[PDB]
Design a protein around this ligand. Structure first.
Ligand SMILES: Cc1cc(CCCCCCCOc2ccc(C3=N[C@@H](C)CO3)cc2)on1
Lengths: 273, 59, 40, 59, 255, 255, 57, 40
């Protein structure tokens, strides 16, 4: 492939460099339209800019935490982190979010990796070996109330059991209701005067519940869960302007008030180098 | 107020004109539908799509 | 070799090697030729 | 029950009216059934809210 | 003697002529088309009013002055009240449509000024409150009036800050969306053909707008000496290939 | 096992079933069809909303009692407010349509009574004043309510005398018009298909009604002993092959 | 596979929607027996409702 | 590839792709045609 062809002096009536940008086109002008060039080859394919590659590496999408401790006398397991739960989403953390929102609709399979590490902040004789159980609780299915409810039987709901310190990995097909996931949605769930605006109403994916299977030892053990997400088989439509201001909320476009100028001011003139 | 054979019966009144016999929304996973076999199976899945057949037999 | 039955379980896809910027760079209704005048 | 995802309503009204023969009286009832058309799709299995338990059963 | 410059668009019972055009943009290089069966889901036969809905509606005019910040209309909202298009809209459960948008602004060879005319698929607005405040319905359904970016923040309304496109992105990059400029010195109209863009084959026309049309002054209007300091901008829009499905009782929407 | 007796008519998104029909009449043995070019005059392409206008609208119900004289509806008037049919009607300059009329009245094998259901092309009514008094507009445009032949003379209204068909002809000869009887002992519905009948290819839908549908008790209703002395009669009507042409601003009509 | 075929107006002596449930059958009635439909395809096989799948986790 | 000798040790079965509701939806002795009268 040639990156530049050889081109010499020109004295024409045919001027490729004068255009009318009002038309909305970006005319494909090249170095050889306005200087004299020599042949050179590309030596490159643009492999690593493919959208599959761009969205295809694992990104941390969520960090939660649960603890193993005596539940005796706990009136609210959920509240004691005896078993936390997460509202599956892909915008709570922003590195990956800005990347996805370069597109309007996106379609892909997900590969999740879940790393779990334990901490024992206060005096323990040892490090126990805990097994985590993460359940998929899609919307419409009983959601766990205690850390050892009938729910955890999970007879119809996919669940994975792995050890703290290890990693769990599995992959979920594209579960969207439509043909693509909306990265943006300028609508409502119905014509209500006070219903919420945005996509919050659209990515009704449900939540995922984590717990330790082990009963309690004499000390307490903090287990912190990190969920990583990798898109595989990516398809993206309609590019948009990149995110400039900071994010404030999952699912709304809102930016913070009295934010700071995002364009760097010159130290000098327009004329400055 | 307690489950009875009678909640399967939609009553009809002689001589009423213009009026309404019954009403329900179509949340097949809840409400009237929920205990029916259809309702009961739909509940093992997260998503549904398709046509429903609703019939009335007169007695 | 796929070891698994479902398609979601396969590895990453392989390069589009599609690449056609004209839907974005030249969505004009009447075709513009480089070198010919923009507005006639 | 999802809003965005909601399916409508079903209602029934007298078109003309029920008329009973002589020597007859009172309410008559309709029985109503529901089943899915061959059209139907269900996907993404999960656990039913229709059954739960507090201790394991025994014999 | 055909110029890129003169054009005629006849759609239904209405025709537009421009003698100073700058080509026309067809979003993503695709022209509006009806919904194919292979893509269909709802089993209902759809209704295609054709020429009674696919004609040109001219919205009320705006006034560009030296202080203008820009205006924003949403589709199909802007047309919610135009003739039979609008009736069909409130009466069917689902509908689908593409449009021809023609923005008009003429001046003289002594004026200067340049407007950006852009179509943004799925333009989800931001609340000026920050945090996770929502933007109420009425605020994103201004109707033919559209939203005036130089109007004041209101409560439950969107933010109207132009350098941020009403969503946290910079004005400068709006050029990645199908768009055309109106530069008084060149141009006097902008025309964009919009194919139907959605993640579902057909949708509700009232709970979801699928494009915002935005006209933004970028190089300020500068009139000749002792000229009146303003120009009107007119927007005329025509639904094209419209289809409605799931007819019934007639939606009632907030406000 | 097909009987003349059971029938199903599906039109648009609406279906009717009768288990006690008496065949169906198709006026003048012709079925509704669109307007051919060879017969066309107006050069405008017409709009054919199809399934959104060609469905069944059920008008409000009447009550047959022993004192009833008969009721009269005009078309397209009776439908002037039904869904998108009606909108199209007020919004185009010209329109054209055929209809399926289904009149319903069920009783038991102890009742007796017989209604005449007849369609009269161009039913010009008479003023009860005599002389050359006219019948004002409002009076001949009752809408879905229709005209109740047992209501009182009003001023500017038509005469409501049944032995004279509201025009100086005898009830007995209405049988020369497409018609069907509903005899409680036989029948429970009447169905008539009306092709478009006019002296022009397309006309105005508001200044001219082209058929009156008339339901007239002829053998008085007789209920079984100690039965309630009345039965409701319901009329459901569906425009078929409708076409509208000459779209614009939306007619404003008296009252 | 078609999920719905195209079907238009009907004025028949052949009524598929009237049945006698006393018989114990569920007659296979479809949208196209009582409204006007357009063609649409299934795009689906019913894989995940197989009893092997239902009892297999 | 089965690594084991016994049939019980193989993975899940594969979709019946059988599907015939008529034993459940139409177990009537004399065949009913849709459109023909239910009771003659
Ligand atoms: C055990 C176990 C646990 C699980 C979880 C199953 C995965 C379900 C999650 C499905 C994917 O979720 C989303 C959510 C949001 C988005 C998304 N939001 C927009 C910004 C873009 O994409 C995409 C996928 O499965 N088995």
């Amino acid at each position: 492939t040639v990156a530049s062809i050889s081109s010499g002096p020109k004295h024409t009536q045919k001027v490729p460099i004068l255009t009318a940008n009002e038309t909305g086109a970006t005319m494909p002008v090249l170095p050889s339209d306005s200087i004299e060039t020599r042949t050179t080859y590309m030596h490159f394919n643009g492999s690593e800019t493919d959208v599959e590659c761009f969205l295809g590496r694992a990104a941390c999408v969520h960090v939660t935490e649960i603890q193993n401790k005596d539940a005796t006398g706990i009136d609210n397991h959920r509240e004691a982190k005896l078993f936390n739960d997460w509202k599956i989403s892909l915008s709570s953390l922003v590195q990956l979010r800005k990347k996805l929102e370069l597109f309007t609709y996106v379609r892909f399979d997900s590969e999740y990796t879940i790393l779990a590490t334990a901490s024992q902040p206060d005096s323990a004789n040892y490090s126990s070996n805990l097994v985590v159980q993460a359940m998929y609780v899609p919307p419409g299915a009983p959601n766990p109330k205690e850390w050892d409810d009938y729910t955890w039987q999970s007879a119809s709901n996919p669940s994975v059991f792995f050890k703290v310190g290890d990693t769990s990995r599995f992959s979920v097909p594209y579960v969207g209701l439509a043909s693509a996931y909306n990265c943006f949605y300028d609508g409502y769930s119905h014509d209500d005067a006070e219903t919420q605006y945005g996509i919050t109403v659209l990515n009704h994916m449900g939540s995922m519940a984590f717990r330790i299977v082990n009963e309690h030892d004499e000390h307490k053990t903090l287990v912190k869960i990190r969920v990583y997400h990798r898109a595989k088989h990516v398809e993206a439509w309609i590019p948009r302007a990149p995110r400039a201001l900071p994010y404030t909320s999952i699912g709304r476009t809102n930016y913070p008030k009295n934010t700071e100028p995002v364009i760097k001011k010159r130290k000098g003139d327009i004329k400055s180098y | 107020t307690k489950d009875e054979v009678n909640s399967y019966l939609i009553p009809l009144n002689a001589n009423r004109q213009n009026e309404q016999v019954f009403g329900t929304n179509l949340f097949i996973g809840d409400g009237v539908f929920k205990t029916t076999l259809l309702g009961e199976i739909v509940q093992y899945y997260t998503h549904w799509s398709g046509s429903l057949r609703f019939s009335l037999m007169y007695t | 070799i796929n070891y698994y039955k479902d398609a979601a379980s396969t590895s990453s896809a392989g390069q589009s090697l599609s690449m056609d910027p004209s839907k974005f760079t030249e969505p004009v209704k009447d075709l513009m030729l480089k070198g010919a005048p923009a507005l006639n | 029950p999802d809003t965005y995802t909601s399916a409508g309503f079903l209602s029934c009204w007298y078109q003309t009216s029920l008329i009973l023969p002589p020597e007859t009286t009172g309410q008559v009832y309709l029985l109503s059934f529901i089943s899915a058309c061959p059209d139907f799709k269900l996907r993404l299995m999960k656990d039913t809210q229709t059954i739960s338990q507090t201790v394991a059963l025994t014999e | 003697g055909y110029s890129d410059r003169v054009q005629q668009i006849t759609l239904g019972n209405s025709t537009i002529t421009t003698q100073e055009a700058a080509n026309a943009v067809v979003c993503y290089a695709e022209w509006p088309e009806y919904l194919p069966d292979v893509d269909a889901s709802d089993v209902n036969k759809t209704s295609k009013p054709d020429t009674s809905v696919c004609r040109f509606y001219t919205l009320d005019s705006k006034t560009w002055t030296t202080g203008s910040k820009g205006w924003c209309w949403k589709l199909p909202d802007a047309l919610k009240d135009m003739g039979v298009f609008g009736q069909n809209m409130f009466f069917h459960s689902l509908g689908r449509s593409g449009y021809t948008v023609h923005v008009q602004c003429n001046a003289t060879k002594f004026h200067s000024g340049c407007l950006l005319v852009v179509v943004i698929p799925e333009h989800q607005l931001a609340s000026h409150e920050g945090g996770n405040v929502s933007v109420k319905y009425t605020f994103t359904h201004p109707g033919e009036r559209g939203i005036d970016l130089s109007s004041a923040n209101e409560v439950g309304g969107p933010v109207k800050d132009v350098l941020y496109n009403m969503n946290g992105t910079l004005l400068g990059n709006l050029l990645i969306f199908p768009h055309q400029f109106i530069n008084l010195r060149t141009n006097n109209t902008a025309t964009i053909v919009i194919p139907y863009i959605n993640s579902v084959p057909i949708d509700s026309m009232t709970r979801h707008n699928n494009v915002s049309l935005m006209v933004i002054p970028i190089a300020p209007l500068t009139v000749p000496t002792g000229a009146t300091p303003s120009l009107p901008i007119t927007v005329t829009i025509a639904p094209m290939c419209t289809e409605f499905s799931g007819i019934r009782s007639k939606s009632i929407v907030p406000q």
